[PDB]
Chains A and B, each alone.
Chain A
Amino acid sequence: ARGLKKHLKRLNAPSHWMLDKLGGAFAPKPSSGPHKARECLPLILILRNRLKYALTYREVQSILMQRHIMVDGKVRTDKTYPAGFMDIISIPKTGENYRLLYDTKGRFRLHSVRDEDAKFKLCKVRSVQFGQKGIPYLNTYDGRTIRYPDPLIKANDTIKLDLETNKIVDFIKFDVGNVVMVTGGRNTGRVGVIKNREKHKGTFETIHVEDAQGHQFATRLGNVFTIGKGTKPWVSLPKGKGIKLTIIEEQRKRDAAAQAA
C-alpha cells in the first residue's frame, strides 16, 4: 500500500468486540488515540452496541455532537475514539458513570461506579527518564506524560491519577505480593496475586500469579497490571471478582440456577 489504511473490514476486527460477521462489510476502525486499537473499545460500540442507546451509525453521531458523553473527564466527540482499559465514561445528562474493566472471558465490560470513584483512574507507568533541562518525566501506557514525578516511581509500577487536579495522588510499587489484573493473552480478566517473577536476560520477564480461589497461572510482564497494595484492590471488580472457572463449573452454574426457575 502507498500509505495508511483507513478501513477495517469486519472479519478483521478484534474478536472481543463481538461484532457479528454478517452485519456489514466494515468495522469502525478506531482512530489513533491513547490505546492501541486492538485493546480498545471505540465509542460507537459503547453507545450503539452495548448500551443500546442508539440504533444506527448516525444516531451515535447525533449523540456525540451534543456533547453528552465524557471520556476520562473531557468531552470526546470523535466517534471512533479508542476508549480503553480503566477509562471512565460519564454521561452527566443521565448522571451515570462507568469504568471500563475486563471480564474473565477477555472482553470489555462497563462496570458502573459511583461519582466518588470516577474522579480518579489508575495508570501503569511505561518508563521514567529525564527530559529537556534535566526534568524527569514518566510515561504511562495510555499516552499520558507526567513531569516531576515522585522520584521513587519506577517503570512497570502503578499510579493513581485524579482527573480533577490531573496529578498523581498515590502509587503502587510493582513487586511480589500485590494484586494484579491480567490485560493480555488467554488470562486477560483474571485477577490474582503476584507470587513469583523470574528474570531472563534478553527476553521477556514472566510473572507467576495465584488466584484467591487457589488456581495458579502465569503470564508475561507486559500483560500484568497491578490494582492494589496487598491483597485488597483499590478499585471495584465486575460481576465475577476476576475468577476464571472451567466450562464444567459454569455448566453446573446454569443447571443449578435452572432449579430455582
Chain B
Amino acid sequence: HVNFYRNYGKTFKKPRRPYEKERLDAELKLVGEYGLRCKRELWRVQYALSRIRNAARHLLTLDEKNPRRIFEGAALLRRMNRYGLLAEGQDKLDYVLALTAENFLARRLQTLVFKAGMAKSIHHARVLIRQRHIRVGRQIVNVPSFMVRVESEKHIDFSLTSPFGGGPAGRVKRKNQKKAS
C-alpha cells in the first residue's frame, strides 16, 4: 500500500513544567499582543526557532574553512535574510543565535496586515485574513500564519473580490438593499 510512504511530523512540543507563573505570563503576553489563538501557535514558533538555533550552534562549533560550515552558513543566512529575520550587515551567523521568537511572530501575515494599516486591530486583522479578504502577490491567502518574505512585503493588498479592496458587496450589504427596495 503506497501512500504509507508519505512523511509527516510534529511541529510543537508541550512545556516540561505545566504550571509555572513566570512562563505562563510571559506566554500570555505574546498570545495577546500578537493576537494568537492558543498556546500551540507560540510553541510551534519556539520549536522552529530551536531547530534553526541547533543548526546554527552546530555550524558555529566547527572551524571556518570547513566547507560544510561555509555552504550551510551561507544558506542559513540567506534563509534568515529572505524572511527579514535579520538586519543588514548581520551575516555573521552569530547573530542568528541572538534571534528571538518575537522576530518570527513579527512576520506573520496577521502582524504585517495590522502594521500596514488595513486592519485597525490585531484581531480585526486575523478575521480579515480568514475571510478571503487579502492577497499577497495575486493569490487569496487565508492562513494568518503565512510568514511573508521581505520581497513580497510590498505586494500585499486587499483581494480583488472582497468589498474592502475589490468588487461586489457582501451578504448583508445586498440583503439590506433588497429589503429596502
- Which residues of the partner chain A approach B1 to less than 8 Å between Cβ atoms? 25
User: Is B74 an interface position by the 8 A CB rule?
Assistant: yes
User: Is B92 an interface position by the 8 A CB rule?
Assistant: no
Q: In the complex, what's the smallest C-beta–C-beta distance from A221 to chain B, in angstroms?
A: 30
The residue from B2, B3, B71 contacting A247, defined by CB atoms under 8 A apart:
B71
Q: Report the separation of the CA atoms of residues A22 and B2 in the bound assembly, to the nearest whole angstrom.
A: 6
Inter-chain contact A251/B71, CB cutoff 8 Å: yes
Q: Which residue of A lies closest to B3 (CB)?
A: A22
Q: Which residue of A lies closest to B67 (CB)?
A: A248
User: Is B6 an interface position by the 8 A CB rule?
Assistant: yes
User: Is A215 an interface position by the 8 A CB rule?
Assistant: no
CB interface residues, A 236-261, toward B, < 8 Å: 246-248, 251
Inter-chain contact B74/A251, CB cutoff 8 Å: yes
CB interface residues, A 1-52, toward B, < 8 Å: 10-11, 21-22, 24-25
Q: How large is the interface on A (under 10, 10 to 19, 20 to 34, 35 or more residues)?
A: 10 to 19
Q: In the complex, what's the smallest C-beta–C-beta distance from B70 to chain A, in angstroms?
A: 6
- Would you give 9 A-B contacts (Cβ < 8 Å), ordered by A? A21-B5, A22-B3, A24-B2, A25-B1, A25-B2, A247-B71, A248-B70, A248-B71, A251-B74
Q: In the complex, what's the smallest C-beta–C-beta distance from B86 to chain A, in angstroms?
A: 18
Known contacts A22-B3, A248-B70; 4 further A-B pairs (Cβ under 8 A): A11-B5, A22-B5, A247-B71, A251-B71
Q: Report the separation of the CA atoms of residues A21 and B7 in the bound assembly, to the nearest whole angstrom.
A: 11
Inter-chain contact B6/A22, CB cutoff 8 Å: yes
Q: Report the separation of the CA atoms of residues A25 and B67 in the bound assembly, to the nearest whole angstrom.
A: 38
Q: Which residue of B lies closest to A24 (CB)?
A: B2
Q: Which residue of B lies closest to A26 (CB)?
A: B2
Q: Report the separation of the CA atoms of residues A10 and B1 in the bound assembly, to the nearest whole angstrom.
A: 12
Q: Report the separation of the CA atoms of residues A119 and B3 in the bound assembly, to the nearest whole angstrom.
A: 46
Q: In the complex, what's the smallest C-beta–C-beta distance from A25 to chain B, in angstroms?
A: 5
